[PDB]
Structure 1
């Protein structure tokens, strides 16, 4: 029996006897994602090249912002693309706070690398007039989170309390189809993913863990290496195949590079609902209390056996 993201979230919502706002929100997100995919896939590029006579970052941000605002389900919107939190105008305010990265990985989108949209959804916890402060919530408080991946196909991965579900965008009918239900990550994987160009500034624990993957001391096959350079692609692979992903801290970068509110946390939430783990090396990513909406956080995520092994090496150096 065929299932869409809309049918799926409606049935979850009416079982919880909710007000409808979260379903309104995810439909808006879904619509924005579909438009982003059309633009990423370069539909109508011919017109820009003069076919009739006479920004992807920004257009993606513009779609997520406007679609989310017009949902009447949000009050505060934090985007990688905006210096300050966007306060929804009063007559459109709903009860959710969304943090998102509209087109993650676009830094190298000139080579047609996979990119994605990342989102995490919170309840406003206070009745104060809405402010930046409403996004300064730990990942533990997440209500929903996930990502759209613009890869060889476009897929939305959606994480809630009910688990992780994968919807494939059928572009012929603009409908997100349920194709993988209540997904769970391998307890131990065989791929490791991190940018080894930074090896000279590696934290010595990172160096030892990576060297244990390439030169294991126990009969075992060395892990394979993958590193797309686009987080949504690398994390999604980690979830499908298992294994470990790392953007760790070092001495030039005490807090890693990736941003906690709209990269690290949603991915950490997907991982943990998938039975995986996500650490900074000092604590669970979902346990960090943010003080700045654009703050960075180290992230080591993926299969639990692998993340656990990394923390074993990490502690050995602390």
Structure 2
């Protein structure tokens, strides 16, 4: 039968007999994502351009406000880390719950003007310390995630939710404002045919990345070369990696020596989705999910996707170390 996000989570949440708090958190997040989607699709833009006479908020800020407010009022969270905010937000005591959430409310906003995909990325942790809530509660390794995923505001809006039972994909039906389950227990292809990275950094690449990409374009075994795709929005590039397989790279380069993407709310959520889908995600040195963060906005290199492709890259990496 048909299933919706709310019903799917409600029913899985009744089964494993948890405190109900994660279900409440996810439902509040879903509401925020639907509201972001509506704003990203520009519903009501006519009023901004004077339809009612001579006359609000950048999408970035509004998306952050929507996630912040819905998570606060879920009574399920205590610490919230957002790409938008310099410091972690500590939820007021009367609305504090069990969970810590790191999120990027509108990934890809530097591509909004060209209208390409934007998205929301989130990662959810159980607060581990009994201390008063603080930034330190978000400094957990991605291995500690209890749920993670993203919403892609693409040609359609889809929510990908990873939990320790696997990855499930929901399509927003805007006629009824309902996320419909359309792909259950998804697994990434063992090996793909697409590679995805910004090759404009070629001058600054490590020898390992340089060699690996040369193998994709000029296969030593004379097989067909991989195709290339790079949207430049991480949700779009990672989602395509999930559904068609292949490999996504945002390595450190000489000008971003610790990486470009942010560990807490870009790399770790996507690494968790990948691993729950049977894929891999590495910094080169170690699994993304094993990095122990020290700073909430710290960066990380990331190479992720189909296991055979990531293993091949790691083989090239070991040769150059």
Residue deviations 1:192-225, cap 9 Å, x none? 0000000000111111000100001113100000
Structure 1 unaligned spans of 5+ = none
User: Can you list the C-alpha shifts for 1:31-82, whole angstroms capped at 9, x where unaligned?
Assistant: 0000000000000000010000131000000000000000000000000000
> 2:162 matched to which residue of 1?
159
The structural deviation recorded for 1:250 is 2.3
Q: Which moved more, 1:12-21 or 1:180-189?
A: 12-21
1:316: Cα distance to partner? Answer: 1.0
How many residues matched? 318
SS in 2 for 1:43: coil
Deviation at 1:295, TM superposition (A): 0.3
Distance in 1, matches of 2:46 and 2:286, equals: 49
- Moved runs in structure 1, 4+ residues, more than 3 A? none
- After superposition, the C-alpha distances for 1:73-94 in whole angstroms (9 at most, x for unaligned) are 0000000000000000000000
Q: Structure 1 CA distance, aligned partners of 2:305 and 2:243?
A: 10
Whole-angstrom distance in 2 between the partners of 1:252 and 1:314 = 20
Structure 1 residue 251, shift from structure 2 partner: 2.5
By how many angstroms is 1:10 displaced?
1.2
TM-score norm. by structure 1 comes to: 0.99
Counterpart-to-counterpart distance in 2, 1:121 and 1:30: 14
> In the alignment, is residue 120 of structure 1 matched against residue 123 of structure 2?
yes
Distance 1:236 1:90 in 2: 37
What is the CA distance between 1:18 and its match in structure 2? 1.2
For structure 2, the residue ranges without an aligned partner over 5 or more in a row are: none
Mapped to 2, the partners of 1:127 and 1:173 lie a distance apart of: 42
Query: How far apart are the structure 2 equivalents of 1:51 and 1:299?
Result: 46
In the superposition, the TM-score normalised over structure 2's length comes to 0.98
Counterpart pick for 2:286 among 277, 283, 286: 283
Please state how far the C-alpha of 1:249 moved relative to its aligned partner: 1.2
Contact 2:194 2:226 (8 Å CA) reproduced: yes
Question: Equivalent residue of 2:112, what SS?
Answer: helix
Deviation, structure 1 residue 252? 2.2
